[PDB]
Every structure is written in structure tokens, then in C-alpha cells.
Design a protein around this ligand. Structure first.
Ligand code: CHL
Ligand code: CHL
Ligand code: CHL
Ligand code: CHL
Ligand code: CHL
Ligand code: CHL
Ligand code: DGD
Ligand code: CLA
Ligand code: CLA
Ligand code: LUT
Lengths: 219, 56, 35, 51, 113, 219, 221
């Protein structure tokens, strides 16, 4: 499965007729779901796959990155701020920004120098991803190869065509979960692990319906 | 106050302007003379070139 | 006297701008020499 | 080379003992310049001032 | 094989091998003090680090020089870790990371008994 | 009229100088307004007709259900606070959520029961709308007929091709009026009949420009 | 097409040397083609045409909008007695007791009714946007977005090289304004002040009047 006609699909068994023609099943993650009809052009459908995988890979680093400064707070490690969305504002703090509870670490103080180094560093590696760089030029734009896969996992192409499906399914789970983290923090105001503890405290009373009457027009 | 004055000689105002109409007089005359020069640049030779000055 | 000060600034910056935009207009090729 | 040479006077006035500041209270004295006035309206006010 | 790309620009690979190898290469003195006839003939531009710097004629022929390359390269690579091994614990000792013995010369005296 | 290359259009006399060549007149509701060029691909234009028609049907169900609890409120029907944009919070009242006013009616307190029932009902029902099933399979995805045309009205193919245009025109301003009701509740904060009562009290003074300086950013 | 440095395969690209090659349908014969359609919205040449009048009219409104939002605000700081100089607080001048006096001058326009402003806006903007689509007395069959003729009175779009050069200047001045007019919206929601009042404060202390002083403004609370 996961390729060809008898792959898994987005309505399970009730999905043999909603699948369009162009979503055949030779790409990874191809469950045949274009209800909005957006990818009827293969020159355009090639471009959204470029966007989806990169959004998938930034979200997998976004999910774990928003979690580990709060799980390590549950191990008692002092951070100055452990909540993910309040984490950026502590370069304005008096001690500044230490990488853990260690003022002998990075000890950042100036926000504008931290941003300006990012524009040069991220600006040049995102340009290498497009055209080419020190780690190779004429490669696959999404699965480039050897310097980013040192461990040789991209061999035996039946495994390699299967690890891609592991990559996108883990990835689509992350983008869905990161869209969680914004909403559950813009509504509640607390962290995700903290709001997990609020639900595991009393699940019947701690749901989104406890905040359902929040955004009402008070006029 | 037997009379009215500028009272603006030791003040050190920039370019001597104290009323903001003077800044528009300083700038509006400048832009107009620039505009006639920029249009008439078509006659003054086109030195869009590697090296085309009064060289030696 | 403000009416007079706004008039001098129109006069001076007229003639100062004929100067500056005059020498830019390819004056070093306004010579009788040949090449 | 004279951009960097301007900074030597800046570094010696904020880190290396400062310079002689004759407007010190109670006679002139050497003062480390701690808060240099870097406002553009204050700095460029001198250049377009009448002589 | 490795079709690569330059860092800033649009072309990778070797910048210039002729800047460092062959007859024309950087020397320990410029051209006005040291011409190409004063080069010892057992130093030709075919190894790295060949600035021709040998006033005391310790090397004789490139076979003898090649075993001193073993003494040169191995003294290099153990020293390069030492410079990081000395400076880095002392700064962490300075900022607040308690090494208790980050300074390099009295490190062993901290761990005796 | 209503079809062919002589249908009425969305600007009238000015409309004929810019109308898209891929819009011909072979589909109901063609007024020639695709200036953004979004439906130039005939495959996506197949999908956008399906998205338009379903949105219209929930709007025609929606717009009628927003005012019937308010017209009955002025005809002496006992409701517990029947205004559509805050009637969802009636389930957290102490008497459950009775339907009209009467406790021997539905009387729902646990929203977890009525939510999870809905997603199983609407799960199979929306799944059957795409693939087919117990109310016919091999039918048109927009107008199946038969089980959904009991009253025989989808005959006389010179009348059925005109009831479509009545289906979508009545559908379009219902979509335009639910976009009405949303904004007139966000800004004002009262039911649309209460807005319509207040506009008729003084139309010169009480209109939308009284609320024009509401969202000025005080900072 | 001549050697005009903006049209054709040698054209400059939106990432410089790191662009590589543009998409296969952006071949460089339309103004402002730096080859940036990474999301590929306009692969259909029927659809790609539809974004260009959609871009150029957005430019020709934003360039009026960029100058129009600051020029009463600039003159307001030099003593011209406006009701409000700030652009996002100038729409509510119809509700004050003196009416909307143009230039702050009571013997000018002196508008009173917001309905009368909107009643005659629609009856005019309907006709001239109607004329922009087709017809109209100023030109019958012309281009949809470079009509010329009575819309080029000074006659400075006649040479096919100069006119192909000034189309590049129009869209780049346009794309400068649309990006900047987007900036007016965000730094008025955030800062709450007029846009030059934001500028005269950043020139006061640039280290502390930057945008990061407003970074903790929308904290969830
Ligand atoms: C046969 C049963 C079956 C059904 C009914 C579905 C249905 C679905 N699958 Mg599928 N699947 C099913 C079997 C299977 N799926 C999959 C694998 C997948 C994948 C990988 C994915 C899906 C997805 C989807 C969703 C696509 C449509 C959608 O996004 O709706 C969205 C719209 C609604 C659900 C309706 C609105 C939400 C809510 C119910 C309304 C309630 C309103 C709120 C209370 C308040 C409103 C807020 C206001 C106030 C502001 C849909 C939920 C996609 C998905 O997960 O999308 C997120 C997707 O990525 N399925 C497998 C494994 C092969 C199946 C095995 O049998
Ligand atoms: C402005 C105040 C400021 C100061 C005083 C420091 C100083 C420090 N930084 Mg930090 N940083 C500061 C802000 C910032 N840093 C960083 C990014 C980093 C990085 C990536 C690293 C540091 C490191 C360090 C620590 C050196 C550790 C050591 O023992 O030396 C060991 C190093 C040497 C012996 C050689 C370098 C000498 C010198 C200490 C330079 C290191 C400092 C920074 C690179 C920037 C210089 C700041 C100026 C004002 C002193 C030290 C606490 C290092 C660290 O985290 O080690 C634990 C490190 O790797 N900083 C950014 C983002 C650009 C900042 C902006 O606000
Ligand atoms: C080969 C390089 C090397 C250098 C430069 C030094 C440096 C020194 N060691 Mg030694 N050590 C070295 C190898 C080693 N030391 C030690 C373990 C110690 C100890 C326990 C002590 C020294 C001490 C000393 C000092 C003796 C005088 C001197 C500063 C003494 C010291 O640091 O007193 C100030 C001391 O007590 N060293 C080990 C582990 C077996 C070594 C590995 O080869
Ligand atoms: C001959 C004159 C004529 C004119 C001018 C129009 C104009 C219009 N028709 Mg058409 N029609 C006309 C004849 C006819 N129409 C139709 C049938 C239809 C239909 C079915 C539809 C239209 C629609 C439209 C609209 C589509 C263009 C648009 O989207 O505007 C976009 C531009 C604007 C709206 C400009 C804004 C004007 C206003 C002054 C804005 C006010 C600004 C705010 C006060 C402040 C801003 C708020 C800020 C704070 C966020 C437009 C209003 C469509 C529609 O209703 O869309 C809503 C539509 O569905 N027409 C028929 C029957 C055949 C006509 C007869 O000749
Ligand atoms: C051309 C577009 C246009 C825009 C962007 C605005 C915007 C505004 N008007 Mg305005 N108007 C516009 C046209 C017109 N207005 C008016 C008459 C008035 C009056 C009487 C008042 C306003 C007011 C306002 C301000 C509401 C404060 C605010 O939004 O908070 C800050 C937030 C922002 C500035 C962000 C706004 C950006 C916008 C939402 C996104 C831009 C895209 C729009 C959706 C496009 C809309 C065009 C459509 C209608 C075709 C706001 C600046 C009120 C005011 O003066 O405020 C004190 C007010 O009292 N307008 C007329 C005559 C009928 C117009 C003609 O078209
Ligand atoms: C007959 C009255 C008439 C009026 C009052 C307007 C008014 C306007 N037209 Mg319009 N038009 C009119 C007829 C026509 N227009 C157009 C096609 C266009 C286009 C393509 C554009 C305009 C634009 C404009 C605006 C700027 C005019 C300008 O560039 O001035 C400068 C010239 C001399 C001072 C202005 C709102 C422009 C616009 O909307 O930008 C915001 C614009 O791009 N008109 C056609 C088709 C040939 C017309 C036919 O008669
Ligand atoms: C208290 C405060 C008081 C403040 C007082 C104000 C003081 C201001 C001091 C400013 C001092 C600057 C003086 C030096 C300017 C030098 C300009 C120049 O050498 O200029 C040289 C260049 C030449 O430009 C080139 O000009 C070329 C001309 O080509 C033409 O000509 C070519 C051959 O000549 C070919 O023939 C070609 O076909 C043809 O098109 C092309 O156009 C090029 O694209 C173009 O880059 O000009 C340019 O870049 C000019 C770029 C800068 C322009 C600045 C304009 C500023 C305007 C401010 C607002 C004024 C408002 C005015 C309103 C008026 C109405 C009231
Ligand atoms: C204006 C300064 C200047 C310039 C442009 C040059 C340029 C040159 N010199 Mg000359 N030279 C200079 C000063 C200068 N020199 C001085 C001051 C001395 C006396 C030491 C010499 C002595 C000298 C000799 C003897 C020779 C050259 C040679 C050369 C050539 C380059 C080869 C080379 O690396 O230089 C060689 C010189 C050096 C590598 C000196 C080291 C330079 C240090 C590392 C730079 C320090 C810069 C620092 C910021 C300055 C401090 C600030 C302040 C004091 C100003 C080139 C034509 C060679 C040549 O032409 O070949 C025939 C050559 O043989 N130069
Ligand atoms: C996209 C374009 C645009 C838009 C929509 C606006 C919108 C607005 N502007 Mg701004 N503006 C813009 C661009 C724009 N501006 C630009 C580019 C400039 C620079 C020239 C200005 C300069 C400007 C000023 C200086 C002022 C406005 C004002 C206004 C407001 C009312 C406009 C008005 O009174 O019209 C009425 C204007 C006209 C109908 C045209 C001018 C007619 C004058 C009065 C001469 C009259 C002609 C003749 C002599 C009399 C007829 C004969 C008679 C005797 C019978 C409104 C918010 C006013 C305000 O309060 O904002 C803060 C204001 O004072 N605008
Ligand atoms: C498919 C389809 C089909 C049909 O046809 C149509 C439709 C329906 C339309 C479609 C759908 C779609 C969708 C659903 C989408 C979504 C997406 C997402 C959500 C993404 C995210 C995405 C997301 C993401 C990236 C994210 C990322 C993140 C990150 C990096 C983070 C970072 C961070 C961290 C670390 C921490 C600190 O403290 C801070 C921060 C900074 C915060």
C-alpha cells in the first residue's frame, strides 16, 4: 500500500470515487484529497509539494522546539521563561538570554544584533537550497542527497520510497499540531503542557467549551 | 516689547530657516531647477559607458 | 520683514542652482579643443 | 583606514580612561565619556548652522 | 563528480592552486628580498606550507624532509586541540561555569588525592 | 435569455468589453464575473461550482434559522435569550437547553453527547454526498434527484434548467446575507432584527456610519 | 525586443546569483519580471494575464495612497489647521461640528452629509471604473491597462524603447508603494500614531524606538 490504486485514502473505504485523476499515487503522502481543486495543474501541483514538505520540516522542528523548554521546566531546571510564546521576550530581561540556567552560556543581550546575524546566515542557506551551495549543486530540490544524509539511509529505493511516507505523515501531523499550539495559547494564554495538565486534571470541565463564550461581541 | 523682530540671529536655526515656509522655499525651488535639468539631460550626451569622461 | 526673507531665499537658491546644475551639464566638453 | 582611525578616539574616551573634559565641575578634569550624544538632529545641527 | 557551488558567488571548486604550489608561490619574504635563485632545491612547490623558509639548512633532500613532515603535521594537530583545550575552560571558569581547575597549568594539581 | 452568449451580465452595458472566454453560458448563474481569473482551468472551474452550490445551501438553511428565533421573540414566544450569535451558550444554562421554552422538550445538558452524535451522523452523510451510497450511488454530485426529488419537480428540462438559476440566485444572496449577519453582529453586538428595528426608528441617524470610529487604534 | 537590460534572459532576478533559473513561463517580456512565482499561482497564461491588471491597478491606487496619506499629515505639522492630520483619523472629520473643511479652510468644500459624499462617489466611480473596462468618451478600443491617447497628454510614451523603459519604472515605483502602504496599515494598528510621528520618534532614539518596543503588545492575556 501507500502507492498505486489500492493505497490508503482520506475517506478510507468510502473514497474510490472522490479521488481525482491527477492524484494517481506515485508521490509520497498522496491520499487523493483535492476537494478545493487547487492542484489540477501539474506545473502548479509540483510547486505545492515544494511548499508542503518545507512547511512539514519546519513544523517538526517547531513542535519539539516548543516542547523541550517546558518539559525541562518539569525537571526543575530554571529558565527565566519556559512558556514557548513568552520565550522570545526575555532578551529584554535584566539577565538577558542564557541558553539554559547558566549565565556562562550564550548570554545574549542585544536583540538587533541577534536578528542581523540571522538575516545573513538564514539568508544564505535558503539561497543554497534553491540554486546550490557548498554541499552540492545539481540535486533533487527536496531530497538532495549525500552531505545531508551521511548515514546512507537513502539506499535500497523501496526503503527510500517508504521513508518518504514516514517523513510526510510525521510531518503533516506536526503542521496540524503546530496549528494547535497557536490556537490553544491565543485562547487560553498558557503553555501546551500546562494546558495538557489542565485537561488531565478534570477532563469533563476543562475543554474548549469552557472558553467558548470568550470571543463574543461585548457590544 | 516696543517692536517686533525675528529674534533669530543667535538661535542657530538650520540654514537660517525659522518659518517652515522657508523650507518649502528652499526645497521647492531646488526641485524645480532639478526637474528642468533632469529633462534636458537628453541633450548632454549619454555616457552610459565603461569610461567616457574628459580623460587623459 | 518675513516677506523679504522669503524673497531672498528664492533669489539665492535660484542662482545657486543654476550654478550647480550648470557645471553638471557637460561643461568639460564645452571647449574649443579637438580630439 | 580613517574610518577605523576615528574609532580609536571613541574607544579611548569610553573605555581607556577618557579625555580631559574642561567643563568638569570645579575646574577641568579627565572624564570617561559614558553617554555620547549620537542624536542625528543634534549632530547635524552643527553642519547646517551659520558660521 | 561533486558538482558544487561557491559560497558567496556562483562558482565553486579550487580558487587557485598556482597561488600556493609550483614555482610561483608565496614565500617567507617578498620578491625584493628573495628571488627564485635563492630557493633550496629540495623545496619545490609540491607540498603544502612551502614558503621556502629554511635559513638553517636542516633538511637535505625531500626524502629527509618527508619524515620531518611527519614530525611537522603531528606536532600541528596535537597543538590545535591544545589551544582550544586551554582557552575554553578558562573562559567558562571566568563566566561562572565551575570547572574548579579550568586554568591549564595547575589543572593536575587540582586532582591529586 | 439566462443561457447562451446573450445572458445578462454583472456590469450590464459595460460588462461586454471584458468577459472571460472560458465563461460561455453553459452553466447556471453565469453573469461573467471572473475578473480575478481564478476559474480559467476547466477542471478547477468544475470544482468551484461544487464549492459554490454547497455553500449556498447551508446559507439558505442558515439565514432562515438566524431570524426565526427572533421574529418569534416579538410574537410572544418564551425563549431563553434567542439571538443567534449567542444562542450556543444556552446549553450552559441550568435547565439544559430546552427547545421552545418547555422542559418536556429536548432538554440537553451534556454537549459531549450532542457533539459526538453529530460528527458520526454528518461523517457518513457528508461521505455519502461524494461517493454515493444508500440513497443512490451513480448520480450527479450536485443534483442527484430521485431520493432528493420526491415531488417530481426535476422534470421538464426547459424548467429544470431554470430552477437551477433560481436555486443559485436565491442561494447567492443568502451567502451574501450570512456575510451580512456576521459583520453586523461583530460590530454592533445585537440581533439583525434588532438592527432592522433600529434602522427603521431613524434611518438618517442610526445606520452603519454611527459605528465607523469604533475600531480606531488607541495607542 | 532590444538589449534593454530589463527584458529577456539576462534580466536581474529576485535572489541575485542564487536564483538560478526562472520558471518556464516567466520569460522576461513584461515589466518587473524578476522571476518570483515560487508558489506558482500564475502558470496558466490566461490566469497570469489576470494578475497583471490586478497588480497594476493596485499599484496605481497605492502610489496615490502613499503620497495621499502623508501629505496632509506633513503639512499639518507646519501649521496648516486641519481637523485631523493623521490619515486613519481623518475619515471621521465628517462627524465634527464644522464639517469637513478642505485644507482646514471653512470657505472651501464644507461637506456636511456622509450620505451625500457616498451617494456621489458611487455614481461617479461606477461610471469611470465602468469606462475602464470598455467604452467611454476618452477612448473606445484601446489597451486595458495602457490606454494612452487622452490619458497621455504630454506625449511622453511614444518611442517604443522609452515607453518600454518607463513601464519598468512605473511598476517598481508601484511595488515600492504597495509594500510601503502595507506598512502604514501594520504600524498604525500596532503603534497607534501617524506614520511620520513614527518616523520622528525613530529619528529621536533609534535604539529604543524600533519595533521591538512593541513586541510584547499582543501578549495573550
Ligand atoms: C470512513 C470514515 C472516515 C471519515 C468520515 C473520514 C473523514 C475525514 N478524513 Mg479521513 N475519514 C475517514 C476514514 C479514514 N481517513 C483516513 C486518513 C485521513 C488523512 C491523512 C486525513 C484524513 C482527513 C479527513 C477529513 C477530510 C475532510 C475535512 O477536512 O473536514 C473538515 C471539516 C469538518 C470536520 C467540519 C467542521 C468541524 C466541526 C465538526 C464543526 C463544529 C463547529 C465547532 C464546534 C465550532 C465552530 C467554530 C466557530 C464558532 C468559529 C475528514 C474529517 C484529513 C484531515 O485530517 O483533515 C484535518 C486528512 O489529512 N483522513 C484513513 C486512513 C487510511 C481512514 C480509514 O478508514
Ligand atoms: C552583549 C553582551 C554579550 C556578552 C558579554 C557575551 C559573552 C558571552 N557569550 Mg554571547 N555574549 C553577549 C551577547 C551575545 N552572545 C551571542 C552569541 C554567542 C555564541 C554563539 C556564543 C556566545 C558565547 C558567550 C560566552 C563566552 C564563553 C566563554 O567562556 O568563552 C569561550 C570563547 C572564547 C575564549 C573565544 C571568544 C572570546 C569572547 C568571549 C567572544 C564571545 C562573545 C560573543 C561571541 C559576542 C561578544 C560580546 C562582546 C560584547 C564581549 C560569554 C558569556 C559563547 C558560548 O556560548 O560559550 C559557552 C558562544 O559560543 N555568545 C549573541 C548573538 C549574536 C549576543 C547578542 O546579544
Ligand atoms: C605532555 C604534556 C604535559 C604538560 C605540558 C603538563 C604540565 C604539567 N603537569 Mg602534567 N603535564 C603534561 C602531562 C600530564 N600531566 C598529567 C597529570 C598531572 C598531575 C596530577 C600534575 C601534573 C602537574 C604538571 C606540572 C609539572 C611541573 C606541569 C605544569 C602538576 C601540577 O599541575 O602542579 C602545578 C601536578 O600535580 N600533571 C597527566 C595524566 C597522567 C599527563 C599525561 O601525559
Ligand atoms: C450598470 C451599472 C452596474 C454597476 C456599476 C454594477 C456593479 C457591480 N455589480 Mg452588477 N453592476 C451594474 C449592473 C448590473 N449588475 C447586475 C447583476 C449583478 C450580480 C448578480 C452581481 C453584480 C455584482 C456587481 C459588483 C461587482 C464588482 C465588484 O465586485 O465591486 C468591487 C468594488 C467595490 C465594491 C468598490 C467599493 C465601493 C464603496 C464606495 C466602498 C465603500 C468604502 C467603505 C465605506 C470603507 C472601507 C472599509 C474599510 C474600513 C475596510 C459591482 C457592485 C456582484 C455583487 O453583488 O458583489 C457584491 C454580483 O453578485 N451585479 C445586473 C443584472 C443583469 C445589472 C444590470 O445592468
Ligand atoms: C479605500 C479604502 C478605505 C480604507 C482602507 C478605509 C479605512 C478607514 N476608514 Mg474609511 N476607508 C476607506 C474608504 C472610505 N472611507 C470613507 C469614510 C469613512 C468615515 C466616515 C470613517 C472612515 C473611517 C476609516 C478608518 C477606520 C479605522 C480603522 O480601521 O482602524 C485601524 C485599522 C486599519 C487602518 C487597518 C485597515 C486596513 C483595512 C481593513 C484593510 C484594507 C483592505 C480593505 C478591506 C479594502 C476596502 C475597500 C473595499 C471597500 C472595496 C479606516 C482607516 C473612520 C475613521 O475616520 O476612523 C477614526 C470613520 O469615521 N472612513 C469613505 C466615504 C464613504 C470611503 C470611500 O471609499
Ligand atoms: C470620461 C471620464 C473619465 C474619468 C473622470 C476617468 C477617471 C480616472 N481614470 Mg479612467 N476615467 C475616465 C475615462 C476612461 N478611463 C479609462 C481607462 C482607465 C485606466 C486603465 C486607468 C484609468 C484611471 C483613471 C484615474 C486616473 C486618471 C489619470 O490617470 O489622470 C492622469 C492624466 C492626466 C492628468 C481616474 C480616477 C487609472 C486608475 O484607475 O488608477 C487609479 C487607470 O489606470 N482609466 C478609459 C478606457 C480608455 C476611459 C474611456 O473614456
Ligand atoms: C531645513 C531643511 C531645508 C532642506 C533644503 C533642501 C536641501 C536639499 C539638498 C540636496 C542637494 C543635492 C544636490 C546634488 C544632486 C545631484 C543630482 C544628480 O546628479 O542627478 C543625476 C541623476 C541622473 O539620473 C539618470 O538620468 C538618466 C537620464 O536619461 C535620459 O538621458 C540619457 C542621456 O542623457 C538618455 O538619452 C536617456 O534616453 C534619457 O532617458 C536616466 O533617467 C537614468 O535612469 C537616471 O538614473 O539624477 C538622479 O539620479 C538624482 C537622484 C537624486 C534626486 C533627488 C531629488 C530630491 C527631490 C526632493 C523633493 C523635491 C520636490 C520637487 C517638487 C517640484 C515641484 C514643486
Ligand atoms: C603605502 C604603503 C605601501 C604600499 C602600497 C606598498 C606596496 C608594495 N610593496 Mg612596499 N613597503 C612599505 C609600504 C608600502 N608598500 C613600507 C612601509 C615598507 C618598509 C617595511 C615597504 C617595504 C617593501 C619591500 C622591501 C618590498 C615591498 C614590496 C611591495 C609590493 C607588495 C609585496 C608585499 O607584500 O609587500 C611586502 C611588504 C610587506 C609584506 C610588509 C608587511 C605589511 C604589514 C603586514 C601590513 C601592516 C598594515 C597596518 C594596518 C599598518 C599599520 C598602521 C600605520 C602604521 C599606517 C607592493 C608594490 C615588495 C616588492 O615590491 O617586491 C619587489 C618588496 O620587496 N615593500
Ligand atoms: C487616492 C487618492 C486620495 C484620496 C481618496 C484622498 C482622500 C482624502 N483626502 Mg487626500 N490627497 C491625495 C490623495 C488622496 N486623498 C493626494 C495625492 C494629495 C496631494 C495633492 C492629497 C491632499 C489632500 C489635502 C491637502 C487634503 C486632502 C483631504 C482628503 C479628504 C477629503 C478629500 C476632499 O475634500 O476632496 C475635495 C477635493 C476636491 C473635490 C478637489 C480639489 C478642489 C479644490 C477645493 C479647488 C476647487 C476647484 C475650483 C476652484 C472651484 C470650482 C468652481 C466653483 C467656484 C463653482 C479625504 C480623506 C483633506 C483632508 O481633510 O484630509 C486630511 C485635505 O485637506 N487630501
Ligand atoms: C491539503 C489541502 C487540500 C484541499 O484540497 C485544500 C485544503 C483544505 C486547503 C488543503 C489543506 C491545507 C491545510 C490544512 C494546511 C495547513 C497547514 C498548516 C497548519 C501548516 C503549519 C505549519 C506550521 C509551522 C511551519 C510552524 C513552525 C513553527 C516553528 C518553526 C516554531 C518556532 C518557535 C520555537 C521553536 C519556540 C520558540 O519559543 C518560538 C517559536 C518561534 C514559536
Amino acid at each position: 500500500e501507500f502507492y498505486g490504486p489500492n493505497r490508503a485514502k482520506w475517506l478510507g473505504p468510502y473514497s474510490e470515487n472522490a479521488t481525482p485523476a491527477y492524484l494517481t499515487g506515485e508521490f509520497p503522502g498522496d491520499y487523493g484529497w483535492d476537494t478545493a481543486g487547487l492542484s489540477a495543474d501539474p506545473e502548479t501541483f509540483k510547486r505545492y509539494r515544494e511548499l508542503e514538505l518545507i512547511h512539514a520540516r519546519w513544523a517538526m522542528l517547531g513542535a519539539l522546539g516548543c516542547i523541550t523548554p517546558e518539559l525541562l521546566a518539569k525537571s526543575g531546571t530554571q529558565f527565566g521563561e519556559a512558556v514557548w510564546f513568552k520565550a522570545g521576550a526575555q532578551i529584554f530581561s535584566e539577565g538577558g538570554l542564557d541558553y539554559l540556567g547558566n549565565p556562562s552560556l550564550v548570554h545574549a543581550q542585544n536583540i538587533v544584533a541577534t536578528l542581523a546575524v540571522q538575516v545573513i546566515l538564514m539568508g544564505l542557506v535558503e539561497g543554497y537550497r534553491v540554486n546550490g551551495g557548498p554541499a552540492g549543486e545539481g540535486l533533487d530540490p527536496l531530497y538532495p542527497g549525500e552531505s545531508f544524509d551521511p548515514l546512507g539511509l537513502a539506499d535500497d529505493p523501496d526503503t527510500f520510497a517508504e521513508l518518504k511516507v514516514k517523513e510526510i505523515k510525521n510531518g503533516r501531523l506536526a503542521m496540524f499540531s503546530m496549528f494547535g499550539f497557536f490556537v490553544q495559547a491565543i485562547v487560553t494564554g498558557k503553555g501546551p503542557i500546562q494546558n495538557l495538565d489542565d485537561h488531565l486534571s478534570n477532563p469533563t470541565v476543562n475543554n474548549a467549551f469552557a472558553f467558548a463564550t470568550k470571543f463574543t461581541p461585548s457590544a | 516689547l516696543v517692536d517686533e523682530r525675528m529674534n533669530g540671529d543667535g538661535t542657530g536655526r538650520p540654514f537660517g530657516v525659522n518659518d517652515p515656509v522657508l523650507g518649502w522655499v528652499l526645497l521647492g525651488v531646488f526641485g524645480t531647477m532639478w526637474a528642468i535639468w533632469f529633462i534636458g539631460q537628453k541633450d548632454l550626451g549619454d555616457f552610459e559607458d565603461a569610461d567616457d569622461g574628459l580623460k587623459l | 520683514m518675513l516677506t523679504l526673507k522669503i524673497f531672498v531665499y528664492t533669489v539665492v537658491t535660484f542662482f545657486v542652482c543654476l550654478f550647480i546644475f550648470g557645471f553638471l551639464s557637460n561643461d568639460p566638453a564645452r571647449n574649443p579643443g579637438k580630439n | 583606514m580613517l574610518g577605523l582611525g576615528a574609532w580609536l578616539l571613541v574607544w579611548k574616551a569610553m573605555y581607556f580612561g577618557g579625555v580631559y573634559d574642561t567643563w568638569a565641575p570645579g575646574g577641568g578634569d579627565v572624564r570617561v565619556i559614558t553617554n555620547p550624544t549620537t542624536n542625528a538632529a543634534v549632530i547635524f545641527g552643527y553642519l547646517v548652522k551659520s558660521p | 563528480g561533486k558538482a558544487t557551488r561557491g559560497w558567496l558567488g556562483g562558482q565553486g571548486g579550487a580558487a587557485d592552486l598556482d597561488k600556493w604550489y609550483g614555482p610561483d608561490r608565496k614565500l617567507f619574504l617578498p620578491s625584493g628580498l628573495y628571488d627564485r635563485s635563492e630557493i633550496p632545491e629540495y623545496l619545490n612547490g609540491e607540498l603544502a606550507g612551502d614558503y621556502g623558509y629554511d635559513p638553517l639548512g636542516l633538511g637535505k633532500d625531500p626524502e629527509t624532509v618527508a619524515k620531518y613532515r611527519e614530525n611537522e603535521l603531528l606536532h600541528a594537530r596535537w597543538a590545535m586541540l591544545a589551544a582550544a583545550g586551554i582557552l575554553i575552560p578558562e573562559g567558562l571558569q571566568a563566566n561562572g561555569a565551575n570547572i574548579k581547575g579550568g586554568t591549564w597549568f595547575e589543572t593536575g594539581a587540582e586532582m591529586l588525592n
